[PDB]
Amino acid sequence: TSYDVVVVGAGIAGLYAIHRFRSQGLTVRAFEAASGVGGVWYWNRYPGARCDVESIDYSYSFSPELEQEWNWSEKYATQPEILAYLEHVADRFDLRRDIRFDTRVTSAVLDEEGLRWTVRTDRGDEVSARFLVVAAGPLSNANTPAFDGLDRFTGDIVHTARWPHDGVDFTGKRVGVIGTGSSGIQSIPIIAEQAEQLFVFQRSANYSIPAGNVPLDDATRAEQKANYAERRRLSRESGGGSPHRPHPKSALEVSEEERRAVYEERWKLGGVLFSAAFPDQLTDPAANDTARAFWEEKIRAVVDDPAVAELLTPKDHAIGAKRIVTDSGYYETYNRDNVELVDLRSTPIVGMDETGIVTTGAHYDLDMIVLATGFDAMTGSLDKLEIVGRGGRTLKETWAAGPRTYLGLGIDGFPNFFNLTGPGSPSVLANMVLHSELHVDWVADAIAYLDARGAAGIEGTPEAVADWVEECRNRAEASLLNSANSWYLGAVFMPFLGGFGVYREIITEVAESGYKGFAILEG
């Protein structure tokens, strides 16, 4: 019942943690609430679900063989593919033996005299760890919205967060979709291809970009695999964790012609990268207007009915303020005779009856309702953990006025505690396989450092967190990601906004310097 590291979660981050700590000779025990490895990719399995970073980038670089040996089937892999891949990773590196599945971590309590963490689960486990590494991910489910009389609907209610493992037939059914986030936009066209009729109930609209999904050319598949090393070097030094430089010059500084060209070129790349076409695109609100504009045009081009195309246009929001969804023929979907878009602003949902949905305006006879839900606060997962630091102070208490960290990897009161890709670090703002690799590596080096010098622990200092808090406030003030209605907010912008490569530089030079900002503890 005692281990060197206790890891929470078995997705991209957790699985790499197990591998990395073990190679260094640490003993690991990992807990996963799910039944299998894969994290978001295991549980989030609705039709059409895929990543929005190129799969060649969005994958592990730690194992040169895996890199060579694994063939991605398309540009943006779907969840069953990414799932197969991670299960392959777990296969290859014998990871499962140190995971306990179906087990939810409930509390973690610091012993201050010993600098150990007693960790407890909902399955009755009680284990002692030198280091607690939480790798619980940035995305947890948003709540299921209370709909009056949902309990009376006689047909089928399918949740995108809990999709049936053996599929759902929409053939011949009248289907209603509530929600138009990634879950919605990704599944809608698939539902639409086989449903009898599809009604899409829209509260607000969000920006999505055509995936432009091509399967990779054989002759390029080996040519990329030869240039992997140089592709990884670029992404690590980059800003988003991908091998992509933004435009040299500013948005408005370059001619109207030369802007429509770059905007078009980045439109091919898709979604995430499109918000990073011009340097000031997520800084200068006039420059962002030019993007909104380029986007609006493309949508009126593809949607037949202006009334509908107007409804599909996100109204009075900044583009890239919330991450752009990547889709496969989503807007096209609305040109079909069997799909209708319903304006929830015009006629809100007042509840459900036996036969379907009730808006103020009409009733909808439906056989099936798909709740296409969204995602809770960046912290999210961690809120459901009970983490008791020094003084018997709780992490929730400590973060009462917003998250406070040093580099994201330090919090005073919480020695030997490491939260993986969350507040204080680039987080969801960079490729997260690479971000997970960076953080695990950093923790691993820190443990090694301690182990060398004969020291008991590492702990963020009061002084260091406040500076980092200040710093995170300052990188953010400029950004159009710093809206009032932005997901990135606590109570406080949560991610570090300065760029991945820069962030990597910082935490690296911190290690090299003997962990300045942290206290080293003897215990």
Ligand X SMILES: Cc1cc2nc3c(=O)[nH]c(=O)nc-3n(C[C@H](O)[C@H](O)[C@H](O)COP(=O)(O)OP(=O)(O)OC[C@H]3O[C@@H](n4cnc5c(N)ncnc54)[C@H](O)[C@@H]3O)c2cc1C
Ligand Y SMILES: NC(=O)c1ccc[n+]([C@@H]2O[C@H](COP(=O)([O-])OP(=O)(O)OC[C@H]3O[C@@H](n4cnc5c(N)ncnc54)[C@H](OP(=O)(O)O)[C@@H]3O)[C@@H](O)[C@H]2O)c1
Burial of 374 (0-12, 13-18, 19+ CB in 10 A): middle
Q: Exactly one of 23, 27, 154, 204 binds ligand Y (CB under 6 A); which one?
A: 204
Tell me whether residue 49 or residue 395 sits nearer to ligand X (CB atom).
49
CB 40 within 8 A of CB 139: yes
User: Which partner, ligand Y, ligand X, none, binds residue 422 by CB below 5 to 8 Å per kind?
Assistant: none
Q: What is d(CA 37, CA 22) in angstroms, rounded to the nearest whole number?
A: 17
Please work out, in degrees rounded to the nearest 5, the angle formed at the alpha carbon of residue 250 by the alpha carbons of 245 and 253: 145
Q: What is d(CA 352, CA 145) in angstroms, rounded to the nearest whole number?
A: 12
Which residues on neighbouring strands pair with residue 198, listed in sequence order?
175, 339
Task: Tell whether 52 is in a known binding site.
Answer: yes
Task: Tell me the residue type at 384.
Answer: K
Residue 436, interface with ligand X (CB under 6 A)? yes
Residue 503, interface with ligand X (CB under 6 A)? no
Tell me whether residue 64 or residue 145 sits nearer to ligand Y (CB atom).
145
Q: How far is the CB of 345 from ligand Y (least distance, A)?
A: 9
Candidates 349-357, 408-416, 428-436, 462-470: pick the segment binding ligand X (CB under 6 A). 428-436
Q: Which of residues 43-72 bind ligand Y (CB under 6 A)?
A: 52
Query: Could you tell me the two tokens for 258?
Result: 């030369």
Tell me whether residue 118 or residue 381 sits nearer to ligand X (CB atom).
381
Ramachandran area for residue 85 (φ above 0: left; ψ -120 to 50: alpha; else beta)? alpha
Tell me whether residue 78 or residue 290 sits nearer to ligand X (CB atom).
78
Q: Three-state SS string across 334-395, please?
A: HHCCCEEEEECCCCCEEEEECCEEEECCCEEECCEEEECCCEECCCCCHHHCEEECHHHCEH
Tell me whether residue 120 or residue 473 sits nearer to ligand X (CB atom).
120
Residue 178, interface with ligand Y (CB under 6 A)? yes
Residue 144, interface with ligand Y (CB under 6 A)? no
Task: Tell whether 51 is in a known binding site.
Answer: yes
Give the chain's radius of gyration (CA, Å).
Answer: 24
Cα→Cα distances 434→42, 61, 130, 285, 501, Å? 19, 8, 25, 30, 11
Q: Which of residues 461-490 bind ligand Y (CB under 6 A)?
A: 487
Tell me whether residue 291 or residue 382 sits nearer to ligand X (CB atom).
382
Q: How far is the CB of 435 from ligand Y (least distance, A)?
A: 10
**Helix, strand, coil percent content, the chain, rounded in steps of 5:** 35, 20, 45
The site for ligand X, by CB under 6 A, has a size of: 34
User: Which partner, ligand Y, ligand X, none, binds residue 393 by CB below 5 to 8 Å per kind?
Assistant: none
Task: Tell whether 182 is in a known binding site.
Answer: yes
User: Which partner, ligand Y, ligand X, none, binds residue 487 by CB below 5 to 8 Å per kind?
Assistant: ligand Y
Task: Tell whether 467 is in a known binding site.
Answer: no
Residue 241, interface with ligand Y (CB under 6 A)? no
Task: Tell whether 261 is in a known binding site.
Answer: no
Q: Which of residues 11-30 bind ligand X (CB under 6 A)?
A: 11-14
Task: Tell whether 278 is in a known binding site.
Answer: no
Q: What is d(CA 253, CA 54) in angstroms, rounded to the nearest whole number?
A: 30
Q: Which of residues 134-193 bind ligand X (CB under 6 A)?
A: 135-139, 182
| Run of H or E residues at 52 | none
Q: What is d(CA 5, CA 443) in angstroms, rounded to the nearest whole number?
A: 11
Tell me whether residue 58 or residue 406 sits nearer to ligand X (CB atom).
58
3-state secondary structure of 503: helix
Tell me whether residue 5 or residue 56 sits nearer to ligand Y (CB atom).
56
3-state secondary structure of 8: strand
Question: What does DSSP assign to residue 500?
Answer: H
Candidates 86-94, 179-187, 352-360, 408-416: pick the segment binding ligand Y (CB under 6 A). 179-187
Cα→Cα distances 73→81, 85, 91, 424, 472, Å? 8, 11, 20, 35, 38
Q: Which of residues 347-406 bind ligand X (CB under 6 A)?
A: 381, 384-385
Q: What is d(CA 469, CA 6) in angstroms, rounded to the nearest whole number?
A: 27
Residue 322, interface with ligand Y (CB under 6 A)? yes
**Nearest of 160, 165, 197, 120 to residue 373 by alpha carbon:** 160
Residue 319, interface with ligand X (CB under 6 A)? no
Annotated binding site for FAD: 13, 32, 40, 51-53, 58, 105, 432
Footprint on this chain of ligand X (rule: CB under 6 A): 8-14, 31-34, 39-40, 44, 49, 51-53, 58, 104-105, 135-139, 182, 381, 384-385, 421, 431-432, 436
Residue ranges binding ligand Y (CB under 6 A): 52, 139, 142, 145, 178-184, 203-204, 206, 322-323, 344, 374-375, 428, 487
* Residues annotated within a binding site for NADP(+): 52, 180, 182, 203-204, 206, 375, 487
